[PDB]
Amino acid sequence: TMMSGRPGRVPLQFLPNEARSLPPPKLTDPRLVYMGFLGYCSGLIDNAIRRRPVVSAGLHRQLLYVTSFVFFGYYLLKRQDYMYALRDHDMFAYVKSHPEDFPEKDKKTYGEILEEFHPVR
Amino acid sequence: SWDKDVYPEPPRRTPAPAPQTSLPNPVTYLTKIFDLLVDRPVTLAREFIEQQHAKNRYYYYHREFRRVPDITECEEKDILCMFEAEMQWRRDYKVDQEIVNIIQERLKACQQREGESYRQNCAKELEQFTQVSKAFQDRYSDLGAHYSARKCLAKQKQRMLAERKAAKE
């Protein structure tokens, strides 16, 4: 279930308040741009299916497609960033709280270690 | 222009011409004709172009890289140091290849220059090339297509272990 049962997770909450501490996704984010591209493609497909000019019919319709896609995508990206930040935060906290389970291996230089040479003939 | 130390050319020994026949050597007349009709205009054109170059005199420099810690002095997963060391190793590999090429050029020039006496008059060049060949082969051979500094390190370590075993016996 991974983080589905995290402590303090308010049910049916798209974006908790703690997400606001994270930087908001830029309105020029490439992922959001791709979302808008998907919206425009949806508009074109809608025009094609309804046997109306693909690149000109219902400019308002295509505009609404793009706006809806971008608008929902912004919050989608914000939630995605929040969840990944939760992942990193929890992982780091667990490593800190369990030092024995995450030891620091001795750092040896290549001059010290011995790697078998496999000749290519 | 080039370094005669890098490219040794023995001092030329041209014999003096001593004609013993009244017949005039055609080669002499032909060479005079060739000089007058070819070398002279070619030299004049060269001089003009050299003047033009002398007017527009600009210089290009030789980039020199500082020494970087080798892969031996590099951490297990330190990709930054590993990248630095690997680039250094590849540069040194290229330099070694060019050294081999220089010695080979020496050998070939000796073979042609000494003519029929090449076998006895190119011993030094042959020995030099043999030394360089041995060194280059021991350092860089059988590493594979995906050669790396770590591979040379491994080969050297294996060689050193074998040397230790031999010396202990």
Side-chain angles (χ1 to χ4, degrees):
Chain A
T1 210
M2 268 295 304
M3 32 236 310
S4 179
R6 279 194 76 254
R9 174 168 174 173
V10 176
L12 302 185
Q13 190 173 45
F14 196 68
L15 253 330
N17 170 68
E18 49 182 345
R20 306 194 62 80
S21 64
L22 308 174
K26 179 177 69 276
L27 289 192
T28 331
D29 211 64
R31 311 172 298 180
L32 196 56
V33 179
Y34 184 67
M35 278 289 203
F37 171 71
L38 294 188
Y40 181 64
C41 291
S42 304
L44 301 187
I45 292 185
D46 192 7
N47 288 12
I49 295 179
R50 302 319 302 179
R51 295 181 40 80
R52 48 172 62 109
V54 181
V55 294
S56 55
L59 293 186
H60 59 293
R61 180 193 312 110
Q62 314 170 177
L63 220 206
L64 185 60
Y65 270 113
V66 176
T67 58
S68 58
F69 271 66
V70 172
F71 189 74
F72 285 65
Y74 170 78
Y75 305 113
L76 192 272
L77 296 184
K78 187 157 54 183
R79 168 163 179 80
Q80 158 191 347
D81 301 358
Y82 166 71
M83 245 62 201
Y84 282 116
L86 276 196
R87 163 203 62 177
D88 282 13
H89 178 59
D90 298 2
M91 165 181 44
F92 298 164
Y94 190 73
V95 172
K96 169 190 55 185
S97 60
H98 292 59
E100 12 74 300
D101 301 315
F102 304 99
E104 305 289 352
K105 183 196 59 179
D106 186 10
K107 307 93 181 63
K108 306 190 304 179
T109 186
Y110 281 108
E112 294 168 2
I113 81 170
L114 185 69
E115 42 193 0
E116 176 60 52
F117 176 69
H118 306 295
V120 181
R121 309 182 207 265
Chain B
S1 60
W2 59 83
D3 304 67
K4 42 237 76 282
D5 339 63
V6 180
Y7 309 107
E9 304 179 2
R12 297 204 170 191
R13 292 156 39 101
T14 163
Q20 71 182 0
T21 45
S22 64
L23 300 185
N25 180 14
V27 177
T28 61
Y29 297 168
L30 295 184
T31 47
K32 282 187 291 298
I33 297 169
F34 180 76
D35 293 2
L36 168 70
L37 297 189
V38 179
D39 307 2
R40 175 173 297 186
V42 161
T43 44
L44 303 185
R46 224 340 166 101
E47 265 69 292
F48 169 71
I49 301 186
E50 285 158 7
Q51 299 155 3
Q52 309 314 295
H53 294 177
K55 304 168 192 178
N56 316 291
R57 188 190 177 105
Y58 59 105
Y59 314 116
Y60 82 109
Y61 309 107
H62 178 102
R63 181 180 270 111
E64 298 198 0
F65 305 110
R66 84 185 85 247
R67 285 283 83 178
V68 199
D70 308 1
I71 192 62
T72 61
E73 42 182 346
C74 208
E75 222 61 57
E76 257 276 50
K77 302 279 102 179
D78 192 3
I79 23 80
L80 310 167
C81 159
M82 281 201 319
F83 170 68
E84 293 273 2
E86 181 67 47
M87 294 299 104
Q88 181 184 234
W89 182 78
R90 292 177 176 276
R91 284 179 286 262
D92 299 2
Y93 197 8
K94 295 166 58 62
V95 173
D96 296 0
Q97 294 171 7
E98 292 303 307
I99 292 176
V100 178
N101 290 3
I102 292 177
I103 310 305
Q104 287 176 131
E105 295 164 4
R106 292 184 180 184
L107 186 67
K108 297 178 176 61
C110 192
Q111 157 82 243
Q112 164 67 12
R113 175 175 46 253
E114 308 306 310
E116 278 287 348
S117 61
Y118 73 107
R119 176 53 50 242
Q120 193 180 7
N121 300 7
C122 298
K124 183 192 66 59
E125 312 287 356
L126 222 183
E127 179 189 359
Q128 288 179 358
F129 176 53
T130 305
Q131 297 168 1
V132 180
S133 171
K134 251 284 112 223
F136 191 80
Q137 187 177 9
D138 293 2
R139 293 176 62 171
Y140 320 109
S141 178
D142 303 0
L143 268 65
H146 310 294
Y147 51 76
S148 61
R150 276 155 32 85
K151 285 186 170 180
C152 207
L153 223 199
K155 188 183 183 185
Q156 181 176 349
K157 281 171 167 291
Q158 190 182 56
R159 187 192 312 119
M160 292 174 61
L161 291 167
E163 289 167 5
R164 290 199 323 186
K165 183 178 180 58
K168 287 180 299 182
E169 298 171 355

